[PDB]
Amino acid sequence: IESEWNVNTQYNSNYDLNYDSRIKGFQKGEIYRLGIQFQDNKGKWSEVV
Amino acid sequence: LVRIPAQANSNLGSLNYYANIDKVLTFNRSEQISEIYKNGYLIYTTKDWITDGKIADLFNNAISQTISVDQVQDWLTRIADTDKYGTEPVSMKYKSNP
Amino acid sequence: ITDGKIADLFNNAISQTISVDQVQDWLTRIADTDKYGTEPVSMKYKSNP
Amino acid sequence: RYDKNRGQVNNLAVSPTNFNLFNPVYSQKNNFFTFRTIDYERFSINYFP
Amino acid sequence: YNPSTTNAKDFVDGSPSEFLVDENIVTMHSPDVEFDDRLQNITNGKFKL
Amino acid sequence: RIIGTTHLTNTLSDISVITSTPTYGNYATGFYKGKVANMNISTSYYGGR
Amino acid sequence: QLSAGLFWSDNVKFQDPSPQDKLERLWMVYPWHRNGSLMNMGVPTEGTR
Numbered sequence: 513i514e515s516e517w518n519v520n521t522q523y524n525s526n527y528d529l530n531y532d533s534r535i536k537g538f539q540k541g542e543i544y545r546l547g548i549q550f551q552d553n554k555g556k557w558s559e560v561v
Numbered sequence: 562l563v564r565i566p567a568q569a570n571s572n573l574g575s576l577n578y579y580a581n582i583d584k585v586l587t588f589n590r591s592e593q594i595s596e597i598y599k600n601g602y603l604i605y606t607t608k609d610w611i612t613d614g615k616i617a618d619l620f621n622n623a624i625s626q627t628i629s630v631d632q633v634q635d636w637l638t639r640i641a642d643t644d645k646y647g648t649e650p651v652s653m654k655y656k657s658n659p
Numbered sequence: 660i661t662d663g664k665i666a667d668l669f670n671n672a673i674s675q676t677i678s679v680d681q682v683q684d685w686l687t688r689i690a691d692t693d694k695y696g697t698e699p700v701s702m703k704y705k706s707n708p
Numbered sequence: 709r710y711d712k713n714r715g716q717v718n719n720l721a722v723s724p725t726n727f728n729l730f731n732p733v734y735s736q737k738n739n740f741f742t743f744r745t746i747d748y749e750r751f752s753i754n755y756f757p
Numbered sequence: 758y759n760p761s762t763t764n765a766k767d768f769v770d771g772s773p774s775e776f777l778v779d780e781n782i783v784t785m786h787s788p789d790v791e792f793d794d795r796l797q798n799i800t801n802g803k804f805k806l
Numbered sequence: 807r808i809i810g811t812t813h814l815t816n817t818l819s820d821i822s823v824i825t826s827t828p829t830y831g832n833y834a835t836g837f838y839k840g841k842v843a844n845m846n847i848s849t850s851y852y853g854g855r
Numbered sequence: 856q857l858s859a860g861l862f863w864s865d866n867v868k869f870q871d872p873s874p875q876d877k878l879e880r881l882w883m884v885y886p887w888h889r890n891g892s893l894m895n896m897g898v899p900t901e902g903t904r
Contacts, residue, residue, distance in 0.1 A: 516801065519847040520567040521575035522818060523715035529734065549743065559746045562716045565782065566801060574846040576782065577717075586774040586887070587835050591663025593771045601833075604895045605883040607861070619881065620861045627861075627883070630895050636867070643898050644868040648833045649891040651774075659790050659797045666766040666773075669840040707724060717818040717844055832898040 580657035587650045601646030603629040814853035817843045859885050865894040 547560040565576040758768040823837040861881035
């Protein structure tokens with residue numbers, strides 16, 4: 513819920529830099545090559561599947 | 562520009578704020594406040610000339626020794642209409658600190 | 660301007676408007692050169708990519 | 709966009725020099741930790757006598 | 758102004774260059790704001806007076 | 807391919823007029839700035855104006 | 856504060872001009888003063904104020 517923005521003002525700039533980089537999304541008609549990783553008991557990431 | 566957010570329990574919108582003002586003020590002349598302001602804003606001067614050089618005392622008592630140019634009963638015909646009503650703008654300009 | 664109500668007159672510009680020539684009171688008080696405009700217009704602007 | 713001429717009613721003196729200055733750095737990916745697929749049947753040695 | 762008599766625009770047109778004081782909206786002037794640059798960048802801060 | 811629309815609600819507009827020579831009327835007001843479209847997002851009916 | 860006062864002293868602009876007189880009135884001077892002569896004058900018929 514972004515309470516900072518309301519319709520009671522002339523202009524509200526939707527600012528997304530106060531959050532993490534998880535704001536990124538995916539274009540609806542795009543093709544993305546996906547994969548998955550696994551972590552060992554030490555924190556070592558395996559290759560991609 | 563600083564948009565003061567909406568204030569609760571008020572149907573008004575978001576307020577905006579300037580402290581750096583660059584304005585020119587114009588007096589529109591009408592008679593919905595007083596019949597005389599159709600010609601312009603009055604010009605205020607002293608009730609009488611400087612008597613015996615006592616300019617300081619006259620300056621100090623500016624509340625009492627003051628009257629508009631038109632209301633001077635001796636100047637009802639010696640001054641043109643353009644030299645007793647002011648109808649020029651006012652330059653308003655200033656800045657503010659944080 | 661009737662009684663200083665310039666704002667209301669400005670707002671109703673659609674209705675309270677008429678060309679200079681059509682003012683029936685000014686059919687002879689204005690010269691022909693001060694009721695028809697025949698000067699160019701300077702059109703200048705730029706655009707972004 | 710790091711310029712302060714955003715969402716202001718005046719917008720009189722704006723230009724490409726003032727309006728849309730941009731800082732590219734914020735458009736950064738997860739480039740530091742990057743991985744890639746590994747072939748199982750390829751012979752890459754792991755023994756150093 | 759009395760709403761039964763005149764409109765807001767017509768009432769203001771009698772002296773549009775008139776100013777009113779406003780104690781409902783104030784301007785706090787503290788030395789920290791002038792001297793400490795961290796307080797000059799506050800944007801919609803939730804505080805009590 | 808057209809995918810959607812934009813919900814215009816308001817428009818922030820401004821005007822400035824400067825004349826080389828003074829006004830014709832010795833007591834003329836000159837440049838007059840009226841109210842145009844500087845309204846909140848809530849008044850979305852008058853959008854795209 | 857020092858807001859307004861009789862900070863000016865000049866003769867009067869009469870219809871029959873008499874600047875030769877050594878008499879002097881005093882004229883009120885405001886913070887945001889008229890964009891013209893401090894003493895009673897305006898729209899000169901011959902040149903500058």
